[PDB]
Copies of this chain bind each other. A is one copy, B any other.
Amino acid sequence: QSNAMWESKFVKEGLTFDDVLLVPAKSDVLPREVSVKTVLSESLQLNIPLISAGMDTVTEADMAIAMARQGGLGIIHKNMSIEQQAEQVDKVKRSESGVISDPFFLTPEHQVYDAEHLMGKYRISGVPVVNNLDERKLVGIITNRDMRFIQDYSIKISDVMKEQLITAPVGTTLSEAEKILQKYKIEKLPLVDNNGVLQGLITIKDIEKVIEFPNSAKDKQGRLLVGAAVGVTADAMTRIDALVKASVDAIVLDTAHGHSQGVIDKVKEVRAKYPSLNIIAGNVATAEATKALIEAGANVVKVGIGPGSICTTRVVAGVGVPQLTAVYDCATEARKHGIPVIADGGIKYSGDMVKALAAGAHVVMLGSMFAGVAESPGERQFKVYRGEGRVPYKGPLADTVHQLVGGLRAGMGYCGAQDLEFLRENAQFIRMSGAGLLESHP
């Protein structure tokens, strides 16, 4: 039928955050008891439904660390050298429990400049010393306590060098090391084989961060999860190869129109080369686009086109979809594949987040709410946000998350939701007019 596309032009209708409210429901569950955890895949498991945007004013290593510590996930932005980005990922992966199975080491023949680089780069504060690279046999350890008395860093590890050291067998756990470090009063516990060949290193920091950040989102090895953004370019594979060597949990293929053919192609290509890699692809606003990314191999779909708070797409190109309808239409399609969606853009308040999750999104992604947080890249106080603009300095990330998560639990309480799955599946909205929205804020 020739005329259908023409006749249907104005037919569709969509809703944004301010058009609706969640409707209260029978609830046996209190806000404090609800579970806010979400699984994006078996290798990607968040304790809070939050991701910081890959954007140069939002997410670099310090941020990805702070996010993961809270149960969420950072995405390292791509506006940096590939070597730089892989390095940013490595810094997040090795922040805690990173040298347990893959330790750095020095030899007596290195300078102390080498020690200070490693401790500085990874924030570890102790370094193992082996006889030689080939042998892998550990002789001595140089640490932060040792650095204090060293005036010149040009001198070799031999000079400022032992005694017997307390070392433990490989596959020693944190709770095991906790007692050893405690019994013997050490802050560093190297791990060797039966031959005394260096295998790994455990520090008290690997211990106390576990205590201090119990909701941390971590891989199986116990290291902080991290994502990274990759464009669709000739550069794409090379960059991914380097990040994968990095061990970063997920790659986000971030483009403006995710329903283009060039993007489907690249997904197909990356899935082929990395069958187990977490591939987050976006951005899409439709069910058809969502279906195409999933059949291309995306294991997560990122959603929204136009809704961003700095996004000029609507005004300049006339293009976009109201975010809740976007999330809803996408989630409707992704649901049939057991595929999670991310809600990307448009979220001003904690209530918006709750609505995004109740319209079907597994996680939400925030740029601007995080832009003035202490841990973000930038330096009353002020900090920049670009895609150009400004937002107040918000203090440490943790305070913003707490109010977000607190809003989420209250909302879950009103809806009677023990967990996010229940919410996505059971929550009902009610549409309201502009005048309906005027009371909502008071």
Interface positions of A (Cβ within 8 A of B): 5-6, 8-28, 256-257, 259-262, 284-286, 288-289, 292, 305-323, 325, 328, 332, 335, 346, 349-355, 358-359, 406-407, 410-411, 413-416, 425-442
- The answer to whether A431 and B14 touch (CB under 8 A), given A27-B260, A257-B27, A288-B26, is yes
**Given contacts A259-B27, A439-B323, is CB(A351)–CB(B10) below 8 Å?**
no
Q: Is the CB of A314 within 8 A of B440?
A: yes
Q: Are the C-beta atoms of B12 and A427 separated by less than 8 Å?
A: no
A16 CB → nearest B CB, Å: 5
* For the complex of A and B, 7 pairs with smallest distance between CB atoms: A318-B351, A314-B440, A18-B435, A318-B354, A317-B411, A28-B261, A317-B410
Contacts A21-B306, A436-B19: A431 and B10 contacting too (C-beta < 8 A)?
Answer: yes
Does the CB pair B442–A309 fall under 8 Å?
A: yes
Question: Most B CB atoms within 10 A — which of A259, A288, A359, A436?
Answer: A436
Q: Which B residues are in CB contact (< 8 Å) with A261? A: 26-28
Chain B residues with CB under 8 A of A19: 433, 435-436
Check if A319 sits within 8 Å of B24, measured CB to CB.
yes
Residues of B within 8 A of A309 (CB): 442
Nearest residue (CB) in B for A12 is B430
Please tell me if the beta carbons of B14 and A436 are within 8 angstroms of each other in the complex.
yes
Contact B425 A351 (CB under 8 A): no
A284 to B346, CA, bound (A): 30
A21 touches B316 (CB 8 A): no
A310 to chain B, nearest CB (A): 6
Q: How far is the CB of A343 from chain B (nearest CB, A)?
A: 13
> B351–A430 contact, CB under 8 A?
no
